[PDB]
Design a protein around this ligand. Sequence first.
Ligand SMILES: [Zn+2]
Length: 472
Amino acid sequence: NPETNLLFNLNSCSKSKDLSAALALYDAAITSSEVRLSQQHFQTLLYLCSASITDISLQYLAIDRGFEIFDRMVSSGISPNEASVTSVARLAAAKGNGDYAFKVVKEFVSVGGVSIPRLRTYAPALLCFCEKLEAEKGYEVEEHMEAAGIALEEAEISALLKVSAATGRENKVYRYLHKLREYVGCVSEETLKIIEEWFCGEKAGEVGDNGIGSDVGMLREAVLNNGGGWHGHGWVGEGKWTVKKGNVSSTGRCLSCSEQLACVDTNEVETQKFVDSLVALAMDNVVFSEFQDWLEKHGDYEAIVDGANIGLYQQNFVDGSFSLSQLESVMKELYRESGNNKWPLILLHKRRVKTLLENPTHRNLVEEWISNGVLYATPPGSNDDWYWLYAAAKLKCLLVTNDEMRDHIFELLGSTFFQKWKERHQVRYTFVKGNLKLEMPSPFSVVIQESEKGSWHFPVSSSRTWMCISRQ
Ligand SMILES: [Zn+2]
């Protein structure tokens, strides 16, 4: 078949990205048999056109050809492909005509049958509008983006931030800086420069004062309610900005302004969704239903320990197990750290618990824990238990485990939230020819933080570098 030979040649070109040769085949194809071109043909062509954009020696023709080529099999009546609509959008946005990029996507999301509207489609439309400083246009595409709707990755927000800065929109820069906090922690270098230029901007300094102006009392109460990080109400204080780029202390005190960063507080809606996720995989039982009911009755525990992890650490699979000596130690250190009120729950398998019961030495002590409620026996058939993970997350309390748990089963669930929660809650231990030295979750967040006085702090993507923002 002549056409199938053509698809081989088109794909052969796309491999080596020779769009000029692909163009000659395309021009020849319209003349040749006459051929009817399958949708794959200029799928390949449009895909190659955008691939060409980044290159210079081929870009200019791709712009000229891309629109007409696109319109050629659009004529066939196939609702354009999600990928293809991104391609023409890139071509448009690449050289001036951002508005075509916007308009084709809007017409696209209208279909909805197999629209599958991806952010990357919306992207070139917004970026081009941003570079041309069309602010209201950019806000409008964002509004549609939220509506469909994929939330914004960093690149899109930073570009949106840049425009509000250039157009001197005070309130919009405030919103988008908060938008950045919510969806990014440590920021890129490119964005960092954008943030820096705004605060040094005379517009920001002069007008920045807003009233409000008061009061720190309401602010500290409002900053607390939203976690450590931020208060919603607006701008604070009067005068011009002072910008400092500095490291931070072990205590998390910013060296420049002598204020320490608040602890990261994980998002509530995120907490429940993590809980719901693990719980769902659990029922596929009544034993776990007992556990849910059980914990609520016995609440609440300030810390929780991974029983298995402690005991096998650090002796070899001789079996060399099982060190209740090491388990008993963590209980001892934690109580004084926790103080005189609460004891840490330990989750161990019945197998481990029964063998411990069998030992005459340990039996009185372990039973004391079980009767008190300081020990719980995970039933057979399960698992690398979420029993403590659930309990730690449900109580939003501490977790004691040496598991990095960087495994496929864990990592599929493991996200951006997971690393936040781990730094937030995980405790680590080391044992050498003595007793435990306890590593703790960091007292301060590594994330964008907002203060009632001023203040804006930005980490950068450990001798980490930060940005400090101070008013007067
Ligand atoms: Zn500071």
